[PDB]
């Protein structure tokens, strides 16, 4: 509350560390469904169904331009990429499997870097 604070966590490396995680996600072999924004002209139903599209290139641009106020807002966009994927793709499809794999990969790196 006012004039009552928990000890200050060192957040000075968060930006660099999220960048590193994001590089690791970008270079994973199962990243291909997520690298670029879904083409809303060419994929029927996507525009109407997925209210907030998200992809790795859009996260990279937000990250590089100071549009994440803290590491939680960064994690929320990464998870949105996988939540979108589950909304639109059967579990038993190449893309549906890619999303589960990437979500796992991310959640481990997240825990190991920050928890």
From Swiss-Prot:
Component of the BRF-1 ISWI chromatin remodeling complex, at least composed of SMARCA1 and BAZ2B, which regulates the spacing of histone octamers on the DNA template to facilitate access to DNA. Within the BRF-1 ISWI chromatin remodeling complex interacts with SMARCA1; the interaction is direct. Component of the BRF-5 ISWI chromatin remodeling complex, at least composed of SMARCA5/SNF2H and BAZ2B, which regulates the spacing of histone octamers on the DNA template to facilitate access to DNA. Regulatory subunit of the ATP-dependent BRF-1 and BRF-5 ISWI chromatin remodeling complexes, which form ordered nucleosome arrays on chromatin and facilitate access to DNA during DNA-templated processes such as DNA replication, transcription, and repair. Both complexes regulate the spacing of nucleosomes along the chromatin and have the ability to slide mononucleosomes to the center of a DNA template. The BRF-1 ISWI chromatin remodeling complex has a lower ATP hydrolysis rate than the BRF-5 ISWI chromatin remodeling complex. Residues 9-113 form the Bromo domain. This is Bromodomain adjacent to zinc finger domain protein 2B. Disulfide bonds: none annotated. Expressed at varying levels in several tissues, whereas a smaller transcript was expressed specifically in testis. Belongs to the WAL family. It comes from the Eukaryota. The chain holds residues 2054 to 2166 of 2168 of the full protein. It is found in: Nucleus. The lineage of its organism: Eukaryota, Metazoa, Chordata, Craniata, Vertebrata.
